[PDB]
Amino acid sequence: FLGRTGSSWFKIFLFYLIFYGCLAGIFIGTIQVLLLTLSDFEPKYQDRVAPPGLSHAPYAIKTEISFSISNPKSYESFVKSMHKLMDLYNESSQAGNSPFEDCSDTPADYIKRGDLDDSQGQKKACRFSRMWLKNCGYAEGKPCVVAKLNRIIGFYPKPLKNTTDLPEELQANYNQYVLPLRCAAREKIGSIEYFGLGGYAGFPLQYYPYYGKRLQKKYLQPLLAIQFTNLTQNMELRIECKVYGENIDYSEKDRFRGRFEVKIEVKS
Amino acid sequence: LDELKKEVSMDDHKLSLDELHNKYGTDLTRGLTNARAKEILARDGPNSLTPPPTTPEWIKFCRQLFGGFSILLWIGAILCFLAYGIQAATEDEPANDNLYLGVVLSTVVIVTGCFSYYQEAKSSRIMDSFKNMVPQQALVIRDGEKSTINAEFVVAGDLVEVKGGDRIPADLRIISAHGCKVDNSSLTGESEPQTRSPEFSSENPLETRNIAFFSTNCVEGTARGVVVYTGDRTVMGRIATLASGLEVGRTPIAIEIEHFIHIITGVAVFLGVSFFILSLILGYSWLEAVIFLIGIIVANVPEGLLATVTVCLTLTAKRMARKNCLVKNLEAVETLGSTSTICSDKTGTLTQNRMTVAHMWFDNQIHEADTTENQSGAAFDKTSATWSALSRIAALCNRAVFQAGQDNVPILKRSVAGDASESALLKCIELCCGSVQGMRDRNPKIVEIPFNSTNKYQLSIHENEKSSESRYLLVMKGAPERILDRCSTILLNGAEEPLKEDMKEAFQNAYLELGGLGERVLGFCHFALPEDKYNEGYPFDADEPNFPTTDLCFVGLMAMIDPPRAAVPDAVGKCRSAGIKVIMVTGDHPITAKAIAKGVGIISEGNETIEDIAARLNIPIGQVNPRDAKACVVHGSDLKDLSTEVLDDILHYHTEIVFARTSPQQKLIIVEGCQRQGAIVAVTGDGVNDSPALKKADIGVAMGISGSDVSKQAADMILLDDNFASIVTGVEEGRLIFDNLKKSIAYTLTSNIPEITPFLVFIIGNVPLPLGTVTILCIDLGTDMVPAISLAYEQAESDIMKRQPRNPKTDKLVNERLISMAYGQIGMIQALGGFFSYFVILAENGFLPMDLIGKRVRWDDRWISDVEDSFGQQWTYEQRKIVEFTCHTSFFISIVVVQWADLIICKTRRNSIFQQGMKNKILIFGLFEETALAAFLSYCPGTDVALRMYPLKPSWWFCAFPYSLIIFLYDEMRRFIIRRSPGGWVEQETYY
Amino acid sequence: EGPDNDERFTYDYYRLRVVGLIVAAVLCVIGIIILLAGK
């Protein structure tokens, strides 16, 4: 033929069949032992998610949400993702004492449901009403963005203490139980309005620590609705929403490390 | 074009002096007119040689920039700029990826260009050396007056004059001469002075006395002649053009390189476009379809391989430089290993090029002297009183002297003023009797008759050094038979005795044997003149026989020859044991050529020519079956009337071939004949008459000390110490580097698979990219470099000089067996070890292997800063990318770890590491430096930006260890099978 | 610890780099030693 005879062509096939078969069987074996060394409830390493990311619902083309108020299908793209998220926070999804629980309607302290063990059933998560998100189809004019803190197993988000000076200096400082979120731009051509649990501009600490998908399915993380009823129009406004805390940090590279990058433009 | 120049020349030495003048419109006495000479100048053109048109270095450099790998790397470099252009227009990408990768790849092409350019070097100044043989000026007779003119202004027809010490300015017809002798070594390779006279003495113009040639010099006397040829039209000017004009051609090693380039280029374009369409079918945007292709290019092309080859060659050439063997062309480092036929000059190559005493006949006994340079033999006789009598004649009846200031150099190497035979005798006595000058001071010469054409003897009368005599001793030497007709007694073991027919017959026997050995034989005799008949003041007349020259006492015979170099016989046998055919090709006479052939082992004992059979059986040569003769001796005059097909039959039908009295073109023809049969041929030589053959040879080797400038220009290799044993070393080195290149190539190729497979699974699996493009270049250009080079220092696995020369048609540098092992077996194991570490990194950070399938869409989505892992955690864009790049880093390090084992297995093709050992210190160096480089690239701060290399946790380093070990075991088991059964299965499938 | 389990999300990449570079250097020196056993 090309290389060899039929007899040789066969033998080279019988070899590579057994050979690659063995190699596949060995590869799988090493994957088995790897998995055997891992927990079902907690990942081996968590230093790469460490400082929590802050992500929002409006799917930004490039950290930007520009549209026209005087146009219907101009914002119907951002309403798709906005709906996708809030559709999960339905009351019909949170039914019965299992696996949900009514928690303080005001920001409270942490809740420990034991260890990362299966020695108990599904760890009961705090309910969250999308109805706590006042004012927010969504904002056809002047968007109503929804913030979110990235989930990390066993992470206890710790707010800053009012020992020294603060950006939003001491205003509504629920020091003990709220992780604040203050959006900014100089360039003050807007109108910041925050909505959340208990009416506070933060995340209620009663939703922590997260026990993971395996130990807490259907779990709901707290949301923080933000509305920009800015009196300006037809210009790119670089708005940055920042979260503050002891366990919260940022990076010049990762522009989502505990903060937002939104470029709103109501070009109408 | 040069087929005309490969033919024997035609001449006009047969014409009379007068007749020759009519042909050139010339005067025998007055010479040309100033006006007629200038007319002929403009007519024929200058008496000069024009160098052939060369290829500029520009085109030579750029021709390498387009050879398979460079072509693919160019397509990659441009395709980078393509994707970059498409980006800069569509979505403003502030990145530098495609732009920088395009710059990097273009640089890789340029630098790789320098390496191949360095390897494909051609240092040739043939025509320049020939031009150096034309004198600046010549002496001509114009308008009846002699004047010096620019030799280029010399034309056919003018009257030229030459004298001892000057170069022949052009081909001349001798019309007048006085004691003129010439050095024709340019045409023959033999430096013994040849007389020139107006008389025609041979039909063959290269042998007649009435022609003098350009490229030669007058050694003594004076001559006048008419110019018959000028410039390019001279006999050796044509040889110049032939030699300088010959197409170089591709080396065996070069052909091998291009061959695997085709193979690897083939699989590259195959998988390249095979997966380019496979991606579009899967619905991949052309934006991405090209990005994957660039990666495929980089994965398939072994970026550092061609440069490795060059370095391995260079390092092999450095070792040979250290044995006095200079390599002018890097590729010639290997040709000697692939050589199946050596065509060797005799004089100054196989031989020392110096008349040396070989045997002596005295006391009715043949004695042998030591002919070797360094005198590696033993003594023959010292005791016999006869010896001292013969020794005295050899010293006394000798007019040769050592040049001043030689006392530092060895006797046999020092320059001597005199003819070759007298120098030989001088050096013979000086060696075994001490200072000859002393013997010539103790015995003052009073009268002598120098060797005469008519007398055929030379005699001398000396004052006997003996005090009790202080009388007159007569000594003489000459033609053995002439000396015999002048002897009455023979000095036997001390005492004289009558010359009976018995001893006279033993003389003839001794004389015939020595002459049969191709040796020049001389007779020696002396006579103690009677005291009473010769007073202490008796005057001797040299002009008229004033003393007896008959009834003298015969002392002995001495024989001499230009002997082989000490190492030559043994080197010839070694070449022949390695299955290399050795042919002699010489300008010298057949009797001498044949005798040295037997001396060095070109013609082995018992082997006969058709002429030998005929003489032994006493029958006509036509009655001899030529197939009964494995040896042959072909004279150039017969070679001339043979067609190439008939030359091919001679080459095919004889194992032991001697081509004697060959011209320079004839040497070229013999070389081409050998090549025509498909053989790789080496030429060894030292003369300008070797230049065409040396050029045409697959590898020409010139002698460094004895070699002429031309020969060393025409060669690929120079033996700087004239050590012929270096050929044996060269062939051995050549074979070793050929095997080691295979090892180094397999090693380099093996790591291509773990660079290809990640890109494929990226498409078919939709998982995060396991390894990056930049990461690949860190391997092929970084870590694999020193290890790959180090394989050039591997010792032989067996006695390589015991095997036959490779068949260049069947035995390839890269074959299917190499690809099967490197791509199908070992590289495949490396790929898995890479993937394993990849799955380990991701799974330990929260992305278990199961959830990875079909996630790249969301993984690469820059706007999703919340991807969910297996444990329900959310990752931003840059966070997961850090883990991904950490995966690139550990996959990279996994390659390094699996290349550890590969380096050790590529060490040997057959033998076990437990047999070959770990005595390669460069290899071990490679292991340490490779690992140091990898660690540095991972842990050095800032490398995460420039190369996207991230720090690895200690446990990460050990992921591929079980795969590294399986490689070592697998290959060790496999080679154990090879050795345990030379049959073929494992052998014919995987044996590189 | 409980709410004070910050060490769980931390890794000393600084020490690892220091050690990694020490090792790389020493492997580089060791290599020179073995190579220079004859040049």
Ligand SMILES: *[C@@H]1O[C@H](CO)[C@@H](O[C@@H]2O[C@H](CO)[C@@H](O)[C@H](O)[C@H]2NC(C)=O)[C@H](O)[C@H]1NC(C)=O
């Ligand atoms: C989650 O809540 C949303 C609230 O808008 C539900 O949307 C409803 O969709 C139905 C049918 O398309 C409409 O008739 C209603 O007007 C919507 N709102 C309400 C309050 O009922 C959505 O269907 C819910 N999703 C799930 C899975 O239950």
Ligand SMILES: CC(C)CCC[C@@H](C)[C@H]1CC[C@H]2[C@@H]3CC=C4C[C@@H](O)CC[C@]4(C)[C@H]3CC[C@]12C
């Ligand atoms: C990533 C995976 C799926 C690709 C696997 C590719 C396999 C099938 C390839 C890789 C190397 C290949 C072999 C390389 C060498 C030879 C020897 C030659 O004389 C005949 C073909 C043969 C035997 C090839 C057959 C196919 C082969 C085994």
Ligand SMILES: *[C@@H]1O[C@H](CO)[C@@H](O)[C@H](O)[C@H]1NC(C)=O
């Ligand atoms: C939000 O909606 C409420 C009614 O639910 C209305 O009273 C109020 O004006 C709205 N706020 C703004 C800022 O438009």
Ligand SMILES: [K+]
């Ligand atoms: K490669």
Ligand SMILES: [K+]
């Ligand atoms: K050559």
Ligand SMILES: [K+]
């Ligand atoms: K490679």
Ligand SMILES: [Mg+2]
């Ligand atoms: Mg010679």
